[PDB]
């Protein structure tokens, strides 16, 4: 009984499509799509990034300044595509009064680990990837997180 | 973006507000934990005990395997209901503090957004002063190169120019810090914001402090929180005794037990009390308890609750006095701001006239370059102070609206209706 | 009213001091709750159990109604005594912090009163400056109307007049804020307060910092609180083990039970074990318990208490260092204030002489109006700084007395003996 | 001594660092208490119960002496392991906050040590200004005694001298307060400290804000603490349920009981069940428990833990935003400091040239003594601001190094390599 | 045992008479007297108000400025005399170290409620009414509580 | 198990000899040595003071300014040698991560008590007396604690 009834009749305005939901679920699905395929290009990855990282990556690609960073790997701390990923668990999310969940994903390769971190944003009834904190040794290129790295 | 879009983005992606909301939801869900002990408590339990004999019980070995299924209910216990009511009151005060947090967020984002504009105005005024002093320096230097006056004027003007340059560096640093702080509180980097136009800036006298005090006392958030805390203390003293009221419980149980005996002495000729027993029993019963002399524990707890209630009442009185002080201070601050706007406008006009007069006198020759430089710095200081007074008056209006306890996005709309032109906050672009 | 009446009204009607006193009284009454478990614990309990049977116990139903009256006492248990001593120490530290709150209240009310007086003085000085500049304006304007000098002087003096007007507005706002703050800290609206006279204001050199430091170390409240906290940590580590000491309890119980049997199988030919039984037992017994291997819990608790005691001792040493810093700072600040009083008196006399000389030079024609206006500004600034230094010296004397640790109403009486003339704090009356 | 020895003495004898280290050690030792309940729990207990008959038990007296030795083990209970992991995470976050405390100590001692030097420089500059104004006073007074100019110059210069004297008193008090604060933070009285030489003071541009942000994000202490807190919240929600998992215990017990009967009715012809019984029994057994319907308590606890985990994640995000703000602010402040150093060097050279020009003009007669006094005070203000900017730049370099998260004694060595000459901080010695 | 022994040898200076004691008791007695009678004039109400509200109301009455406020009802939030009152309970007051206790009284009329608030001040061995916080919709006149309402 | 492993590999630089250890132990030994003998001169008291109070007392003796204070009694709050001392107990000290611990000693004489306070410095594997806080009535001379009493 005594339902929570959250006081947030907001947190919407989502444009593009996405997966069903669940933070660990969507992060794991996005990583699995990246490893299983070999493209990792933004056009195929559009559903998992909602409305701001997609446009930022688009204009960074059209900028012809960050070609190396945007062509080797923009989402992993290295220059090589990982071999396996394990997202930190989170036992679902109560109601909808929750946003900006940072999750650390153990990004494991053959006898190696980097343990990156990624922010996650709700945008309505869904969950989407954001930031990617670039938390690990031997940072790929530029510096900081992806959003600060490609920010003009 | 203007103030509305900045505030909407800040509210959509603020961590502290989300944390306060999560805390409120947790305190709201605590009601189920508080209500749990009143509901039936059902459990299961099985065991297996092996007993070996000793002393006069030599040669006696027993093996007992038991299972049981129990159910318990509290028929009459006021302590649980009082705990539930306490949890309800705690949830209420958490809701109130969440509302106060929301108001604080609105006030903070408005303050930061206007601080950025104030820094931009300060930097632009300082840069204009530097340009004017540079023009004066160039004129004096060219006059000396032709040759009309000694070197003192050049030295004084260039010293003033160096001081203004240092002030400009400081102002640019302050602007950069302010814009970064706005990004931090909002979560986005804004290249340009709506400025404040002077044509449509019209002031309005506030309501008399009487109706202000009435509405503030009726609808303030801090006073409501204090009242809820005092009511919580009253329910705490009501609950604190819980020792003179007898308790009543109802229990039910279904149990099976299988006992087997073995040993050297168990193989005798008795054959009656040393055989396997398979008992299946279901019990339904009631239990009645009543403390009578607890050693003075309940009386001491009650008196402590009385003292805590008195302290809560004192805290509520202090909160009311602080609310009155806040309302009076906000009203006086608005009145000072509206008077100072006109005072600084008149001061700026008079300072510009004085600078023109000093320039004419220097042209005649009755004054000196230090005097005209002083007039210029006074004029620019007056303009800077007028701009700061405007940006402080807007914030003061928002502050009194918040202290009244009825601040929402409509007030932000009223403020935002006065912003028309956009200006860029890039340090390099404004001063190339 | 003067300072004594203000302080008395503040003490009699303050909510924060009342809250601190209520908290102290609650912590004092905690002693009875701590002492309760050592006293006899008496209780009553009755129950009724219905039992149905199956399996090998098929056809057996029992009804058992029981009542009991129990009494328990703890013959030997050092943990309860240690808890009582801990509660005693907590009550002591609460009394100490209540005394500190009293000192803080007296310091705050004195500070607010003298802040109001300083605001009145600043406003009056600014008004006098405005009157002087207005007189200069009128003289220069009438001279130009007759016609002797150019228009530059009028413009410059008008700019100065406008700036002084803005300063007057902000000073009036500050005074109103200060008087409202005093009303908030006291609870009453005071129309007039005793001012400070300059004939009877005589300064006294403070005691040497040596005896000051000695008395402060002996009698400071914060240091005493730290010492009590360290003693509390010592008693906590003494209580920490409580696991190597065997416990002893004494129990008594008067109980009645009535058991009745019924069922299809209970109507057999036995007629011996299936009849109504009425048992009555009054039991007196002793219980002895002794932990031997607690899994290392007691050793870990003892070591944690050792670390906590070390931390408490470190906190006490930090408190002592802060007390020494406070005493040294108060002495140095008092000496600075008493020197600055004389420095500013000499400065204001020199500034008045300089203003007279500049006026004479302007009459001759050597100087200009900007110079005499600057001299006027310097003179009035010196007067304001002297008044502020006086009030700061009085507040500083109270501050050093508080840091010594022996501040009471006698120091308030000593301060109040220097206030003679009453002045009204109404903005409208002081600004006709 | 120089900065290295001052820091070493501060680290060796600081109370607050000792307290933080003791708290961390206590949190580390809490692991043993958390691990205790998993280990075997062994105990002993003896009792003596006397029973007197009543009602149908009239004439029945019993005396029972019992002893028992018990041992209990928890075969399967995930709650204990989860509590152990929670204690582990708490110890980790305490270690992190201890490291942050170390960083804070280093920053604080450096700030105080440089504040002392800044105060010394300010006092020396003010004393030099007083000497220059005194020289001007003496020259003007002797010229008037011979007789060349009116008394206006004497009056104005005397007023300036008095104001400068008041400022000197204030600066001396500030220096004394600063040196006492340094002694408080260190624990020793330092008569002389290494000063700052201007020959070897060479500035260096900082690393680009990108790599700064990268390293700060990877290795900040506050962000690491936030991450550990979020992991602790995750383990808390994992532990939260602990209700759906059945528990299993193993018990053993060696017991002896001696029962003796006596009474008027106990002397009957039965002689079978009314005789002394000496029973010894050693028991081993297993107990299995399983909650099935807890009334919704476990579900509510799990949901509350989910809300708490959401709140902890949001607090982590807020900490990350604060880290970004700190890094950006530190970089901008460093750049402002390095720019302002050059700006103030140029300004002071310009002011010296201007003062020389004004003195030459006064010798010619075009200027007045107020102008040269203004030039002198502008020069000394510029010098004071340059020194303050230098010290602020050094402190800001340490600040950005600390915010990066890799501050240690090597940075203090780098700072100390720029300190060469020793100067005494005695107020009387510097200004006899 | 262990009597509290409060550290407050003060809080005296009472001039006029009053009722026995008890904050809820005196508030209930005051409201019952006002409801039962129809005069509600200050002269008959002297014992219940302490020493300052009495003289403040006397000089306000002699001022002839707040006649409209003072003639209908000064103590209720409305312009009409209430029909029943119910003061919030308080389990007596320990010792004497307690002052300025604000109590909220439910002021109930026919199908209406306003729930005003009144301050309680000790002044010695007694209890007396102060302020009256005017906590209710559609206040009588002026604004705020009575003390600021009638303050010059 | 789970050894604390304190994180301080420092707090050394010991010059002179000293007693085995234990704060209460060394305080009791120092007071017993002073009471049993009658000299109390600093030459024989060198082990119990560390490196700074010893040299401070030496240079105060060579200064010939505090002759009365140093000749009557430097360590007791009186001008006469005490008759018995009882140092506040402390159940040893865990590991070495602990320094500057103050203890209050009851300085009992014939029907008298003053209860002075003394600081303790570890500085190695030992414990040493410092400061002495002169916490008692009728302070001997100068003022404050001994260290700042003889400080120039």
Q: Please enumerate in sequence order all residues whose Cβ is within 8 A of that of D27, keeping only pairs 6 or more positions apart, or say none.
A: D90, D91, D94
CB pairs under 8 A between A and D: 51
Residue of B nearest to A5 (CA): B25
Q: Residue B405 in contact with residue B225, Cβ under 8 Å?
A: no
| Resolution for the entry shown, Å | 3.6
- Residues listed for chain C: 432
Q: Residue C320 in contact with residue C226, Cβ under 8 Å?
A: yes
Q: D48 — contact with chain B (CB < 8 Å)?
A: no
Residue of E nearest to C18 (CA): E98
C234 to F88: CB separation less than 8 angstroms, yes or no: yes
Residue of A nearest to D237 (CA): A91
| Interior/surface letters F106-132, b for 16+ CB within 10 angstroms, e for the rest | ebeeeeeebebbbbbbbbbebbbbbbb
First to last CA, chain A: 51
3-state secondary structure of F77: coil
Q: B341 — contact with chain C (CB < 8 Å)?
A: no
C25 to E99: CB separation less than 8 angstroms, yes or no: no
The burial class, CB within 10 Å (0-12 / 13-18 / 19+), for C9 is: middle
Q: E148 — contact with chain B (CB < 8 Å)?
A: yes
Picking from F5, F21, F2, the residue whose alpha carbon sits closest to that of residue F124 is: F21
Per CB-CB distance under 8 Å, the chain C contacts of E151 are 189
DSSP code per residue over D293-310:
E-SSHHHHHHHHHHHHHH
Q: C299 — contact with chain D (CB < 8 Å)?
A: yes
Angular region, D44: left φ>0, alpha ψ -120 to 50, beta rest? beta
Picking from B257, B241, B345, the residue whose alpha carbon sits closest to that of residue B300 is: B241
B297-364 helix and B369-404 helix, angle to the nearest 10 degrees: 150
Which residue ranges make up each domain of chain F?
Answer: 23-149
The burial class, CB within 10 Å (0-12 / 13-18 / 19+), for C432 is: exposed
Q: Residue F96 in contact with residue F8, Cβ under 8 Å?
A: yes
Q: A81 — contact with chain B (CB < 8 Å)?
A: no
Tokens representing B115 are 């601080």
Domains contained in chain D, number? 1
Strand partners, B247: B289
Per CB-CB distance under 8 Å, the chain A contacts of D299 are none
E strand or H helix at B186: helix B152-186
DSSP code per residue over chain A:
------S--------S---S--HHHHHHHHHHHHHHSS---HHHHGGGS-SSHHHHHHHHHHHTS-HHHHHH-SSSSSSS--SEEEEPP-----SS----EEEEEEEEETTEE--EEEEEE--SSS-EEE-----SSS--SSSS-HHHHH--
Write out chain C in H/E/C secondary structure: CCHHHHHHHHHHCCHHHHHHHHHHHHHHHHHHHHHHHHCCEEEEEEEEEEEEEEECCCCCEEEEEEEEEEEEEEEECHHHHHHHHHHHHHHHHHHHHHHHHHHHHHHHHHHHHHHHHHHHHHHHHHHHHHHHHHHHHHHHHHHHHHCCCCCHHHHHHHHHHHHHHHHHHHHHHHHHHHHHHHHHHHCCCCCEEECCCCCCCCCCCCCCHHHHHHHHHHHCHHHHHHHHHHHHHHHHHHHHCCCCCCEEEEEEEEEEEEEEEECCHHHCCCCCCCCCEEEEEEEEEEEEEEEEECCCHHHHHHHHHHHHHHHHHHHHHHHHHHHHHHHHHHHHHHHHHHHHHHHHHHHHHHHHHHHHHHHHHHHHCCCCHHHHHHHHHHHHHHHHHHHHHHHHHHHHHHHHHHHHCCCCHHHHHHHHCCCCCEEECCHHHHCC
- Identity of the residue in E4, E10, E98 whose CB atom sits nearest the CB atom of C29: E4
Distance between CA atoms of residues B107 and C56, nearest Å: 77
DSSP state, residue D204: -
Residue span of the structural domain in which C215 resides? 1-428
Distance between CA atoms of residues B277 and B255, nearest Å: 13
Tokens representing C33 are 């709750």
Q: A3 — contact with chain B (CB < 8 Å)?
A: no
Distance between CA atoms of residues C188 and C180, nearest Å: 10
F97 to D21: CB separation less than 8 angstroms, yes or no: yes
D21 to F6: CB separation less than 8 angstroms, yes or no: yes
Q: C219 — contact with chain F (CB < 8 Å)?
A: no
Q: What are phi and psi of A21, to 5 degrees?
A: 165, 180
Per CB-CB distance under 8 Å, the chain E contacts of C25 are 4, 6, 94-95, 97
- Identity of the residue in C30, C51, C166 whose CB atom sits nearest the CB atom of B340: C166
Q: Please enumerate in sequence order all residues whose Cβ is within 8 A of that of B273, keeping only pairs 6 or more positions apart, or say none.
A: none
Strand partners, D63: D50, D260
Cβ neighbours, 10 Å, residue E53: 24
Residue of A nearest to B28 (CA): A4
Distance between CA atoms of residues E145 and B216, nearest Å: 11
Tokens representing F30 are 């120092």
Tokens representing D261 are 């009967």
> Is domain E23-90+97-150 classified as CATH 2.40.160?
no
Inter-CA distances, D34 with C79, C349, D22, F1, Å: 21, 75, 19, 12
Distance between CA atoms of residues C43 and C35, nearest Å: 18
Q: Residue A31 in contact with residue A87, Cβ under 8 Å?
A: yes
**Residue showing tokens 């990792």:** A40
Distance between CA atoms of residues C27 and C11, nearest Å: 22
Distance between CA atoms of residues D347 and D386, nearest Å: 9
Do B and C make contact via 3 or more CB pairs under 8 A? The reply is: yes
Q: D309 — contact with chain A (CB < 8 Å)?
A: yes
Q: B293 — contact with chain D (CB < 8 Å)?
A: no
Highest CATH level, class, for A23-150: alpha beta
- Identity of the residue in C48, C49, C159 whose CB atom sits nearest the CB atom of B351: C159
Distance between CA atoms of residues C304 and C240, nearest Å: 9
First to last CA, chain E: 51
- Identity of the residue in D11, D18, D25 whose CB atom sits nearest the CB atom of F100: D18
3-state secondary structure of E20: coil
B343 to C30: CB separation less than 8 angstroms, yes or no: no
Distance between CA atoms of residues D159 and C346, nearest Å: 9
Picking from C129, C134, C119, C114, the residue whose alpha carbon sits closest to that of residue C171 is: C119
Distance between CA atoms of residues D376 and D132, nearest Å: 8
Distance between CA atoms of residues B288 and C65, nearest Å: 11
Compute the nearest-CA separation of C113 from chain B (Å): 16
3-state secondary structure of B272: coil
Q: Residue B301 in contact with residue B241, Cβ under 8 Å?
A: yes
Do E and D make contact via 3 or more CB pairs under 8 A? The reply is: no
Distance between CA atoms of residues C103 and C407, nearest Å: 7
E strand or H helix at F121: strand F116-121
DSSP code per residue over D39-63:
S-EEEEEEEEEEEEEEETTTT-EEE
Q: D53 — contact with chain B (CB < 8 Å)?
A: no
Per CB-CB distance under 8 Å, the chain C contacts of D49 are 283-286
First to last CA, chain F: 51
**Residue showing tokens 């004494």:** C250
Distance between CA atoms of residues A145 and A131, nearest Å: 6
- Identity of the residue in C26, C163, C176 whose CB atom sits nearest the CB atom of B332: C176
Q: F148 — contact with chain C (CB < 8 Å)?
A: yes
Inter-CA distances, D267 with D52, D60, D261, Å: 16, 10, 10
Q: E13 — contact with chain B (CB < 8 Å)?
A: no
Residue of A nearest to B22 (CA): A97
E143 to B313: CB separation less than 8 angstroms, yes or no: no
Distance between CA atoms of residues C229 and C96, nearest Å: 11
Q: Residue D273 in contact with residue D80, Cβ under 8 Å?
A: no
Cβ neighbours, 10 Å, residue E68: 11
Strand partners, E116: E105
Distance between CA atoms of residues D371 and D356, nearest Å: 12
Picking from B215, B201, B181, the residue whose alpha carbon sits closest to that of residue B401 is: B215
Distance between CA atoms of residues C184 and C180, nearest Å: 6
Q: B336 — contact with chain C (CB < 8 Å)?
A: yes
Query: What are chain A's partners, defined as 3 or more CB pairs within 8 angstroms?
Result: B, D
Q: Please enumerate in sequence order all residues whose Cβ is within 8 A of that of A143, keeping only pairs 6 or more positions apart, or say none.
A: A149, D210, D211, D212, D213, D214
- Residues listed for chain A: 152
Q: Write out residues 366-405 of B within 8 Å (CB-CB) of D.
A: 368, 370
CB pairs under 8 A between A and B: 35
Compute the nearest-CA separation of A97 from chain B (Å): 7
Tokens representing C137 are 């304006």
**Residue showing tokens 């705020």:** E144
Do A and E make contact via 3 or more CB pairs under 8 A? The reply is: no
| Interior/surface letters C353-388, b for 16+ CB within 10 angstroms, e for the rest | bbbebbbebbeeeebbbbbbbbbbbbbbbbbbbbbe
What was the experiment behind these coordinates? Answer: cryo-EM
């Amino acid at each position: 009984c005594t339902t929570v009834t959250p006081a947030y009749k907001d947190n919407g305005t989502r444009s593009g499509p996405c997966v069903e939901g669940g933070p660990d679920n969507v992060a794991q699905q996005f990583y699995d799509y990246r490893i299983l395929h070999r493209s990792n290009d933004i056009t195929a990855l559009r559903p998992y990034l909602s409305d701001k990282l997609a446009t930022l990556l688009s204009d960074a690609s059209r900028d012809n300044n960050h070609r190396e960073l945007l062509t080797n790997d923009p989402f992993s701390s290295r220059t090589t595509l990982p071999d396996s990923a394990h997202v930190a668990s989170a036992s679902t999310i109560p109601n909808r009064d929750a946003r900006n969940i940072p999750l650390r994903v153990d990004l494991k390769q053959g006898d190696q680990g980097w343990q990156d971190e990624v922010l996650m944003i709700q945008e309505g009834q869904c969950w989407v990837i954001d930031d990617v904190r670039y938390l690990g040794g031997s940072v790929h290129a530029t510096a900081g997180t992806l959003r600060q790295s490609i920010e003009n | 973006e203007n103030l509305m879009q900045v505030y909407q983005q800040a509210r959509l992606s603020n961590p502290e507000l989300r944390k306060s909301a999560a805390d409120r939801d947790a305190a709201f869900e605590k009601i189920n934990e508080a209500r749990s002990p009143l509901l039936p408590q059902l459990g299961l339990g099985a065991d297996y005990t092996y007993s070996n004999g000793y002393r006069d019980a030599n040669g006696i070995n027993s093996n007992a395997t038991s299972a049981s299924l129990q159910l318990t209910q509290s028929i009459f216990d006021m302590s649980k209901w009082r705990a539930l009511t306490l949890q309800e009151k705690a949830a209420g005060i958490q809701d109130v503090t969440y509302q106060t947090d929301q108001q604080t967020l609105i006030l903070n984002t408005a303050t930061a957004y206007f601080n950025v504009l104030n820094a931009i105005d300060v930097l632009s005024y300082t840069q204009a002063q530097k340009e004017a002093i540079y023009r004066q320096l160039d004129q004096t230097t060219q006059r000396f190169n032709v040759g009309l006056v000694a070197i003192t004027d050049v030295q004084n003007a260039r010293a003033q120019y160096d001081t203004v340059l240092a002030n400009e560096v400081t102002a640019r640093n302050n602007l950069d810090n302010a814009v970064e702080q706005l990004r931090q509180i909002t979560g986005n980097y804004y290249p340009e914001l709506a400025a404040l136009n002077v044509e449509n800036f019209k002031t309005d006298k506030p309501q008399p402090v009487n109706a202000l005090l009435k509405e503030a006392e009726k609808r303030n958030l801090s006073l409501l929180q204090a009242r809820l805390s005092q009511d919580l203390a009253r329910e705490q003293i009501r609950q604190a005794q819980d020792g003179h009221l007898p308790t009543l419980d109802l229990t039910a149980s279904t149990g099976i037990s299988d006992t087997s005996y073995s040993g050297s002495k168990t193989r005798g000729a008795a054959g009656t009390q040393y055989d396997d027993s398979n008992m299946g029993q279901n019990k339904v019963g009631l239990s009645f308890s009543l403390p009578i002399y607890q050693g003075g524990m309940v009386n001491s707890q009650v008196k402590q609750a009385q003292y805590n209630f008195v302290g809560a009442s004192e805290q509520l009185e202090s909160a009311h006095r602080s609310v009155v002080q806040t309302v009076r201070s906000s009203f006086n601050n608005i009145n000072a701001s509206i008077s100072s706007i006109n005072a600084y406008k008149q001061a700026v006009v008079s300072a510009q006239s004085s600078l023109d007069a000093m320039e004419a006198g220097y042209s005649v020759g009755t004054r000196t370059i230090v005097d005209v430089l002083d007039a210029t710095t006074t004029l620019y200081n007056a303009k800077q102070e007028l701009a700061n007074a405007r940006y402080n008056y807007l914030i003061n209006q928002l502050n009194i609206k918040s202290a009244l306890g009825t601040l929402n996005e409509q007030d932000l709309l009223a403020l935002n209706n006065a912003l028309s032109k956009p200006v860029s906050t890039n340090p390099e672009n404004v001063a190339p």
